[PDB]
Every structure is written in C-alpha cells, then in structure tokens.
C-alpha cells in the first residue's frame, strides 16, 4: 500500500506491506500535514499480527488525537497505553514549516534519517528497549532543517546498507521509494516507511 500527499511545504509517501503470508500487520503509522505543520509517527508492535496491531494501533490513535502536544508528551501517553499490552517500538516527528523546525522523540528500533543538501545528516542511534508502560527517560531532539532536506522513518522490516545514499540521490519521494524497491521484495517482516521532501 502506498499513500502520497503534497502541499507547498512538503511532499510525503507512506509505504506499508505485510510480512509474506500474514493477514494482520503489526506495524502502524499516522501522517497529517496542514499548511502550517506535520505530525507523523511509525510504530512496530511487539509480538506479531493482531496483538502487535493492538499496540501499534493504539499509538496511531494517540498521535492523531494528541497531535498538538509536544512529542515527548505524546510519546508518554503512548507509553501509558502500553501497560497490559505487548508494547511497541515507535518514533514521533513534528515539523513546523514556517520555522523549518522539527522535533523528534523515539524509543526502540524505528529509525529516522534526515539528509540535508549540505551533506549533514541527522541519524540518531536507536534507543534500547520499547514502550512498555514502565518509566522512560525520553530524549527529544529539536533542530532546524534547510530547504531541500529529505527524510525517512522506517520500521525494522526495511534493511538497507546505506539509506543516506538513497535520500541524497532521489529527487522526489516517489523516486526515493522506487530506489528502495529491492529491499521490499522478500517480505521477511512487516515493512513500513514514511518519506518526506521538505521545501
């Protein structure tokens, strides 16, 4: 499944495909942009299939509902919703277009890479563990991006040697998605990614 959106400030593409032979995806995403701001999130539920879905889907619902809050507030709501559930790894990104500012908070193995034209990348290491409902000491990143920046957020189902290169070479989110096609054919796990190109 592919979903594309565009406004004056960003173009985005969401890709998701289930693990081969699996009916119920354990990954979830949420994406909304208006003329002023973006929120997006990607999550991978612990366990698999349905119960994994309950955890990642709870994340998607809370990010939509609480989108106006700061990323760390949103992720803590997500953490509290994981008590008595499988848990999930998750990443939450907000962008203010006028300021060209992003804010990012994550726990687990959902990765975020933002490539700058100038050749700077923001590519944080994964935070160990997962959102379980037990206490967390979150790290929030706040930074300015430059016009032309391109990013991806992806679950562990996408395994790529050099993601930065795909972001650098692509001229659009469709092109970057197509550039990644070889990594999508095996379907060894659920695979979700969100691409963005920022004006």
Longest CA pairwise span in the chain (Å):
45
Burial state string for 162-176 with b = 16 or more CB within 10 A and e = fewer than 16: ebbebbeebeebebb
Closer Cβ to Mn ion, 10 or 42, answer by number: 42
- Measured from the CB of residue 64, what is the shortest distance to Mn ion in angstroms? 21
Cβ closer to Mn ion: 72 or 156?
156
Count, residues near Mn ion per rule CB under 5 A: 5
Q: Strands of 97-188 (E only): list them.
A: 101-107, 111-115, 121-122, 140-144, 150-154
Residue 156 interacting with Mn ion (CB under 5 A): yes
Of the two residues 69 and 156, which places its CB atom closer to Mn ion in the complex?
A: 156
Q: Which stretch binds Mn ion (CB under 5 A): 42-50, 73-81, 161-169, 179-187?
A: 42-50
Smaller CB separation from Mn ion, 90 or 198: 90
**DSSP three-state, residue 71:** helix
44 contacts Mn ion (rule: CB under 5 A): yes
Among 30-38, 47-55, 96-104, 187-195, which window interacts with Mn ion (CB under 5 A)? 187-195
Structure tokens at 117: 């034209």
Strands of the sheet containing 191-198, edge to edge, are 2-6, 10-17, 191-198, 150-154, 111-115, 121-122
Chain centre to alpha carbon of residue 77: 17
CB of 127 to Mn ion, least distance (A): 16
Binding site for Mn ion (CB under 5 A): 44, 155-157, 189
């Amino acid at each position: 499944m592919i979903q594309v959106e565009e406004n004056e400030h960003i173009q985005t593409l969401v890709y998701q495909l289930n693990k081969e032979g699996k009916s119920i995806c354990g990954d979830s995403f949420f994406m909304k942009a208006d003329d002023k701001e973006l929120i997006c999130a990607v999550a991978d539920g612990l366990g698999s299939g349905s119960l994994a879905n309950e955890s990642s889907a709870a994340i998607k619902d809370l990010v939509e509902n609480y989108a106006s809050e700061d990323v760390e507030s949103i992720i803590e709501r997500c953490n509290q919703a994981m008590k008595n559930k499988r848990g999930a790894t998750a990443s939450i990104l907000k962008i203010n277009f006028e300021q060209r500012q992003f804010t990012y908070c994550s726990v687990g193995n959902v990765r975020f890479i933002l490539h700058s034209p100038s050749g700077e990348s923001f590519y944080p290491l994964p935070i160990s563990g997962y959102l379980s409902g037990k206490p967390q000491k979150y790290k929030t990143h706040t930074a300015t991006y430059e016009k032309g920046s391109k990013f991806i957020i992806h679950t562990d189902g996408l395994n790529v040697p050099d993601i930065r290169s795909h972001l650098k070479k692509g001229q659009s989110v469709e092109e970057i998605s197509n550039s990644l096609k070889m990594y999508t054919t095996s379907r060894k796990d659920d695979l979700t990614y969100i691409l963005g190109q920022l004006s």
